[PDB]
């Protein structure tokens, strides 16, 4: 039964909104202080904390599409969502371009709130 | 620290099950509805183990795990992320090395840790 | 032969809507649950018209000419048809040089309320 | 292979099709295809091929595991349907290494005399 | 442009030179008269496809050719006469031009024209171009 | 090989199919009869040059074609009739073959043949090929 | 201009204090590089310091004039934001007056255009204390 | 398997003896690598030795098992001739129990075919004396 | 420019030729060339060009320092000669950087009515 | 026209000697002090026949066909002539695949003791 | 060691004469029949200074000389070989570095060192 | 006057013969113990002594051509020769190949014999 699946989609959407608005404070509230991240911008390295994503919230016409979302409920305090993210944007040439990414978010419940404890993206920035 | 070497233990049994080509144990370690992102999937999300079966039918290699980080989420779920370096030989026999970024998501159901979803980057 | 001329008409109207960037006429000729395989989708299957709106707004006054080569129409009753054709596009790049691009296209038409609509389409070749 | 009542019929005849191709059975493949079947595929090099004469070369001249991802089905009456899906193929090259390939496929089925047959199909990606 | 019974051969050379001059001047009006309405065409601008009509070349007459210094050179022309009303000429076209801020450039193409006299007037029924 | 007044059009189709079959079988004898001794040719094997005669294609009849499974497919044929004694056909040739240890391969070319009836027999006076 | 680290695995051990000293002078070095401060960098470097780096094209440069070019031209001009991350620092202590740190340096920066780019460089810094102050006698960089 | 050097510019200075010691143990290290002698290489290396090299793909490997693969498979099999040259060695002495050598390593070898090939690698070796014996605590290689 | 009695005549008319090309003087260049002069050069794209009509495009449409290296001269009577040499050209691109180019040149001179003229020339390398 | 046929004869004999690898006949038709620009010389001018002997011995029983396209002959008296032509070579590679190569060639003939000999030649294009 | 810094001195006056674009001094430092191998010569041997003139007509750069080796041959001839690294800026202004392998051949005629031939590799 | 030019050509030819025969002893006699060499096999590094060339004398159908030789006589004890060396050879494919090099030899007279004190080659092995 999808009791909390919508509950996961809610905080996921709030995450997307915090990224879109460039609001780093809301992103800090939704992430564990010791959050780890694999991503193409990490160049294959395991980077910990929000110190790495900060550089993007302080320096950043697009359209985002989420394809094939899968949610794994792991009890009453752990969840994990994986999906394909397709981003349509305009390059410096003003030409339409599209980029695909495969994203995995690991959510943990602490004190009645979902927080990202690990993030894994591949393979487009 | 204590329940971290259990995640490490089932992870080592997982990697060893992959290196020995033991599909029988791998199936036991994976949930039937396990999802996976990996280069072999060509950007698509593959569910189950029917996709991973083909890679068990198919000499000396050496695996080195670097910077393992473990996130504990309660008492029935965890997630381990690490860098996997692999030294091997290519037909002509020259030593080669490949890097991978792996994330395993473990969950305890019926008193047994199992992979529910895993994410790989690189090779 | 008369039944295929209708499909030719609605197809040419579709390509005219894409060429002129008329997204409203495009939405009228497309089913709300339309699926599409296209090079801009990066091998993924996308559903709905929300994915093409981005190309209607941003990408679309440079002269462009479109040519339809060797259409083939399969009639499947009085309410369903399929058309496959080669689409050539002569355009100008940033340097003003004349250029040309080929694209293989498949359109799956379904007559609903006496009005043909695309339920699925498949484009290949260069975008 | 790997992956509400009528959709499973299209899925069934489609799986029978893919297995008829994997085994090299041109007989059952010919029975499941219309004689005027049209095709877009990388083997046709951007051209539109008609009939089954182009596909015979492969059954005659040509360890594989096929996987189907996210099948979508469009029903257009009780005699016309259209299925689109992702086709992953795990195989071995002459070098012996396992390779994987992706191809987006679109099949257009039409019921004629109580039997579904392919009238047109469109594949992109893996040649 | 530079070029290079026999009377008839020369006639074909005449209508061909007028064709090249019409293309160079961007005069689609004269280009239409020398071409059959159902003219067949193979050219690299068609990307391996067969093009019928004059709608396809109109895009190049309108845009590009309507104009920096350009010199054409015809090399090794061969003419096949096939009766009073049919002929075929094949030759090598070399074009010297300038790109952006020249930098003088040169390009080669191999061209075949199939001429047919209809109602006392030579018209192209089909032509073939390579490497352009 | 698969292909695909009107009687005359079909006649051209006949001699053309016989040409393709003669090339496929490596039968230079029959290929010589259907070609004019002074046949003109543009083809990628000539590297942008114009080739006259049948000496040039003989190297391909002797060496290569004298033989793994190969299937030809003719797409979008167009025929221009230019009087009783002249005709021209243009089409797309697609060849399915095998390289070394196939690995089935496919290749496209755009071909133009210029036929001329001399003494009650169609002969090629010139032909043009692209992308092969 | 700032920098982060990953010191949880390194600090655990016998000699926390000296490890912290070497990380301190290392972060002061990287801070002097990020700000183009050639004065502080000169104070933290031995006069006879040797260097291996991609800018040397496989050669062993000695002194500070080779790096002075980059301090004067490239790093002095930087007004764009640059963020440095020190991943997985390992410290080898070799007596009271010598140490050696190795780490992965990840640089987040803005290119010519306004596009964020990331660069990785494996760095080895060899520290030697003379006159009661740690100084670099040799360093080795890989990657660009 | 042999190796040459260029020690005329390095030996001139105050501490000839210790410089010669470090060059000696360095040439013994390279000699153990050229012969695939994992025993001698193990004796000359600290157990907690760290490493940066192109084989590590920008990662910091620790221990000796990563190099053991190359000793067992690649370097044990070598029956072909290999000649190593140590160009421009620079030595930094950091107390009685620590030293650091940097040099250009040029390898003349025979490839798969019988064609002579040359490889360059910039090498930094960090030596620390424990139990009266010099050992590598860290090294850094560039180039292939 | 830069670099036993008759050879200096060929060298003299050759230097006058190269300077006539560098200044863009098509008049003196035409006087020094035979009307039926043939040419191999990279600008001809592997073809053999006849006359001076092909070279006019350059005098009309087109900081250079030319150097001649190792000139060899073959005398074949008192009315025919052939000189071969290396031609280095130091110039500046639109980027402003000094560039250097090499071209091997062969000139075939023939004395007609008491004046040497080029009947044929062959250049390789720099286009 | 008769005077040019002799040059055609000696030129065809030269190409026959190169094709059959007959180095002695090649030395008879070449002046001892012959100069050559050729792609095998890497932009350098080589003198004598010692440089071509290497190609006669080592490189030269695979079927090869040579075609001479558009020859042009300049007569410069009764003892000196020049011929320029395009040379096509159809051959087989290591894989047995038919291949073709173009080459622009210039031959400078000089009649000595009633026998034409090459004093200089210039080849370009692929070797 | 003493007559090595004279070769170094005339070499430094040479390099400085090149950096300042002073053809006048360069001509004095070179024999009129000086031969040269260099990438700008495209593998050919250029004699004299007419070829080097063009490179004097044509902002901050930094030159570093590495591993200079001097061979003394008597009392009127010497030869110095060295590696020349050059840091510069490319139009867009990114710092760049180039390596060169240079060999200068000095000879004392009329009481003055002069280059008779020089050989360069790389940039 | 070319008094010693032929005298330089003699020892140059003897050098070429020592290389062709693989005789490393004769090459040692004709080279100064502290000979320096720039060459493509040195990868831009200045290598000293005959220790580097040894590897080639102990591990090695061709034809060599010398073009445009220039000799610089620098007194009665120093000379310097520069020339272009073109080598025709057969590759592993059995295909004729050709390679160009630009060579500079610096000869010094000591005890009545010419010896190579410096060598510079570019840019083919």
Author numbering:
A (entry chain E), L (entry chain E): 343 to 402, 409 to 473
B (entry chain F), K (entry chain F): 344 to 401, 408 to 472
C (entry chain B), J (entry chain B): 344 to 403, 407 to 473
D (entry chain D), I (entry chain D): 331 to 333, 344 to 402, 409 to 473
E (entry chain C), F (entry chain C): 331 to 334, 343 to 404, 407 to 472
G (entry chain A), H (entry chain A): 329 to 472
Q: What's the publication's text?
A:
Ca2+/calmodulin-dependent protein kinase II (CaMKII) is a Ser/Thr kinase that is particularly important in neuronal signaling and cardiac function. We reported recently that the activation of CaMKII-α by ATP and Ca2+/CaM triggers the exchange of activated subunits between different holoenzyme assemblies. Our data are consistent with the idea that the CaM-binding element induces the hub to transition from a closed-ring form to a ring-opened lock-washer configuration, which can release or capture dimer units.
The first insight came from a crystal structure of a dodecameric human CaMKII-α hub, for which the crystallization construct contained an additional 22 residues from an uncleaved expression tag. The tag contains an N-terminal hexahistidine sequence, followed by a PreScission protease cleavage site (GSSHHHHHHSSGLEVLFQGPHM). There was partial density for the tag at four more intersubunit interfaces. This docking allows the C-terminal end of the tag to connect to the N-terminal end of the first α-helix in the hub domain proper.
